[PDB]
Amino acid sequence: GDQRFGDLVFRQLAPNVWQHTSYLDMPGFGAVASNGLIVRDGGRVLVVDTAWTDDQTAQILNWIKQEINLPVALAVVTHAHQDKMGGMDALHAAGIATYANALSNQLAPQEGMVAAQHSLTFAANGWVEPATAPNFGPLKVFYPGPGHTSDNITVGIDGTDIAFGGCLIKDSKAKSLGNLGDADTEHYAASARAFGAAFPKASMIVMSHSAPDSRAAITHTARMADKLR
Ligand SMILES: O=C(Nc1nnn[nH]1)c1cc(-c2ccccc2)n(-c2ccccc2)n1
Numbered sequence: 477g478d479q480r481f482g483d484l485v486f487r488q489l490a491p492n493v494w495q496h497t498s499y500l501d502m503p504g505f506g507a508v509a510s511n512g513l514i515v516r517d518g519g520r521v522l523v524v525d526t527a528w529t530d531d532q533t534a535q536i537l538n539w540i541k542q543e544i545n546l547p548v549a550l551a552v553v554t555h556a557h558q559d560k561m562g563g564m565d566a567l568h569a570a571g572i573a574t575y576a577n578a579l580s581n582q583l584a585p586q587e588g589m590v591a592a593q594h595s596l597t598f599a600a601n602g603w604v605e606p607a608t609a610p611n612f613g614p615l616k617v618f619y620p621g622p623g624h625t626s627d628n629i630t631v632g633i634d635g636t637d638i639a640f641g642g643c644l645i646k647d648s649k650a651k652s653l654g655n656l657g658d659a660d661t662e663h664y665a666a667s668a669r670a671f672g673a674a675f676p677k678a679s680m681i682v683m684s685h686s687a688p689d690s691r692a693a694i695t696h697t698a699r700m701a702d703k704l705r
C-alpha cells in the first residue's frame with residue numbers, strides 16, 4: 477500500500493497512522509531510506525521524525541495537507557542525527573512546535589542540527605516526564621537507554637499495536653547495526669530490550685531503516701548488540 481508523493485513514500489499502518497519514508501544517496505553506497513511516523517489524533521496531526529532534508533520535510537507537510545488537511549500540532553524527533561532532525565527548519569517555518577530529548581537539543585549544534593524548540597526530560601524508569609510533553613495525545617515517549625546514540629528515544633502509539641524504535645531497532649533479518657560511530661556498545665543490548673519491555677503489547681515494530689516487522693526485530697537487534705560487548 478505504498479503511496480508515492482514526489483520523492484517520498486507514505487504507507488498506512490493503521491486507520492490513523494502512516495509511515496513516512498525519505499531517501500539520501502551518496503557515492504559508493506546505495507540510497508538509504510529513513511522512516512518516521514504521522515499520526516492523526518482526532519482533529520490534529522502529530523509527526524515523529526523529520527526527513528533527511530528541509531525540502532523533503534516540507535513535502536511531508538504537503539502530503540499531510542492534501543490527504544489529511546488538519547493542523548500539525550507538534551513533532552517529536554528521536555535523536556540528533558540528519559535522518560531524524562535534518563528537516564527541523566521546515567517544521568519551524570510551518571509553525572509546528574517541536575520536541576526532542578534534552579540531550580538531543582544539547583547535541584544538536586555540534587551535530588549540525590537545528591535544535592527542537594522544547595526539551596523532553598525522562599524519569600529514571602525511562603518514561604518521559606509528562607510535564608515536559610504537553611498535549612502529546614497518544615504518543616508515549618520512552619528513553620530506553622543509550623544504544624545507537626546516547627540520546628535515542630522511542631515512541632509508542634496508544635490505541636494501536638505500533639511501537640517505533642527509530643534507529644535503535646533493526647529488522648529481524650538485518651545483517652548489521654548500521655552506523656555505530658556514536659553508539660554505546662556496552663548498553664545497546666539492554667536498551668534494545670528495554671524498548672521491547674516498555675511496549676510489550678506492540679506487535680508492529682516500526683524503525684528507521686527497514687519496513688515494519690514483528691517483535692523479532694527487537695530480539696534480533698538485541699542479540700546482535702550482545703556481540704558488541
Ligand atoms: O544515520 C545514518 N545511518 C544509520 N542510522 N542508524 N544506524 N545507521 C546515515 C546513513 C547515511 C548514508 C546515506 C546514504 C548512503 C550511505 C549512508 N548517512 C549520511 C548522511 C549524510 C551524508 C552521508 C551519509 N547517515
Ligand SMILES: [Zn+2]
Nearest residue numbers: 555557625643
Ligand atoms: Zn543516528
Ligand SMILES: [Zn+2]
Nearest residue numbers: 559643684685
Ligand atoms: Zn538512522
